[model samples]
Target chain A: SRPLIDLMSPVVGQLIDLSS
Target chain B: QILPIRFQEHLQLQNLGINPANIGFSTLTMESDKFICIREKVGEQAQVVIIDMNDPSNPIRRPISADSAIMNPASKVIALKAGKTLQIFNIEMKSKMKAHTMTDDVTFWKWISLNTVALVTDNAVYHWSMEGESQPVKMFDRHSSLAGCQIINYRTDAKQKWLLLTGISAQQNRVVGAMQLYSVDRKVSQPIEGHAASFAQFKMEGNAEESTLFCFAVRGQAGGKLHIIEVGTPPTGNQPFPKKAVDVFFPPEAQNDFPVAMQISEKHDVVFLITKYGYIHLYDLETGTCIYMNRISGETIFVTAPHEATAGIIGVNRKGQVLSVCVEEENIIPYITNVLQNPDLALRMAVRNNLAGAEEL
Candidate 1:
């Protein structure tokens, strides 16, 4: 089920220098 | 400038009787437009879906099912939780990015920063960077010698970009005990004590041009007031650590308020906190004056702040009555006449009086 189709992911994938 | 003039209630939502109390009303701002995510039971389940700011109706309901969830900071991504398992999904993508599991017992989870999320287990607090695996940074066993630690509450500074973790040693006697303030940046987690003592609340007052006021609503610590403290940031390097700013508290009469809920909007410098007895208090830290104080109609069960600072708030009572409130600056021009003659303002005054009168009856 889909909703709010306009918003997108900020970070596409994982990196070692992660800012989590 | 004079601070908040009035706190008004606008609208109360429809109640779903007595069965569905575990309602979830989550809201966030993406690119300046406001969106509210309501997940609640309807007809055995009712209006359980996301509505634009155009309409706000329920607490918890979503297209894809999950036990718990958190919206992305300033974005539409959502991390769905079913037990310790996390289903990170994007609204635009319309699919789960991937699934990840955490250590058991997720006591807390929140959006720490844009694209960055944090969660806590029984043992430690962990962060899963948007692009990295989750790792334990602030372990309870390591920081404090408390045998079994429990996180009481957490607050994040959206402007300053930091997380303040407040926790207790155990659930029993938890509210009476001293709270540990784990001031966290991206790397090191520094711990401080006496940020609060006894049934404390952690919240940010308002962000003016210069700074946002952070406070700890302590009950019996140093005369029991909301202690305002500063956490100094370090330069960009792994070598330096954060410095602790000396703490301060509000006045004596302002003491022992035992705040129920507070609203700190961006435009308004004054903040409002409802005391234990539904006594509404308008407080301005700059002038060191409490400003104005009044009483709500009945004992408040829950008080919700606006998604941001505004004249708006929501309070629920034990009798299941909901109050949608509006708080505005008090010392404005035409204040008295506006209260007496203005049509809309007059109506609000009448309803507030009705509540007060009902209490006496």
Candidate 2:
């Protein structure tokens, strides 16, 4: 299961980098 | 390897006016309010057909002269090919009978001043005042091969500028070629000899490999490297052409095969290499990376920006059986589906369900 994160949080930036 | 596939129908010509038969192989243009098609006929005859696409479905053809043919289409005017002539037609005119014509094909021509036309095909480049009959105006014939070939017009500092790029092929060997660059200003067309050798060369290596200079573009001069070459101003008249600053972009890996079917997105600064295999490779100019590669079956005939918001749609003719159209936009799962299902909105489906998806899925 994927961890839930805030929509606008900069931590979401890390997730995008990993996925990309 | 089974991939998670997605499919969508591209509404390429739904709201645009285009005729499949008469659309020429090389020349095509899309202006703010009009779609223009040019086809080369027998003899010295070239047909210039203008479709007023204000009403997309049923478009009206603007009347043009039977003699002149459109070589290149600009925002307000079009350049006539062949002969020693330059014809300027008023786009705002309601009737085609009111459109004006300028005849003088011997010299190479470019728009020097606002409402002004310049000719540059002679041994040297020449300019003509649009309002009144001026002299041969300006000349620049110092180079060996002064064959005025192609001219590209672009905007800079809220002003319009013209960059003329000339090509010369070796008589003995077709692989050997040379090109020159000339910058035009309000006063005259100056020969930028220093920037001459900076031109990219197309060569054929082996007997089987055939290379042709299909298209090229400059970043600051034009947005992308399609068929047009862009040149900006030099800081000093004596300054040699800036090697590092000069940027040239080419098409994708497979596109060298189909020179006639290349597409460029100036606004997005991307070059699309469309091949006979029905695959498209999208290359980014700024990053110099092939970001996206896609494929579709069928013979793609044309691509045009139906509206400003989307990355233009593509038209495909499937072995003369049916016509298919599709679009490629960011964040959208781009797909190629049969254009036949949606008869009510022909070539206008965003996505396909079970029935329609069966054809292309």
Clashes of each: 23, 17
Per-model TM-score versus the true fold: 0.58, 0.45
Name the 10 consecutive residues with the lowest summed lDDT in model 2 chain B: B195-204
Flag regions of model 2 displaced more than 4 Å.
A1-20, B1-21, B25-33, B38-48, B61-67, B71-82, B91-122, B126-139, B142-162, B166-178, B184-279, B294-307, B311-361
Give the per-residue lDDT of model 1 (tens digit) for B1-361. 3333544443333342333253322222121124334344555523224434334453334444455556664566667665677767766566666567666867667665566667766556666677755443442322443225445445566543444565544334323333433433333444443223211112222322233345444444444344333333322332221112222333455443344455544344345555444555554333223445566646543434343444445454444344444444333323322432334432333233221211211
**CA lDDT of each candidate?**
0.43, 0.34
lDDT of 2 at B159: 34
Please, what are the lDDT tens digits per residue for candidate 2 over residues B250-340? 3465422231233444344344444434555544322333444556555553332223333333334322211222234422222222222
**How displaced is residue A13 in candidate 2, in Å?**
49
Task: Using DockQ, give the best candidate's number.
Answer: 1
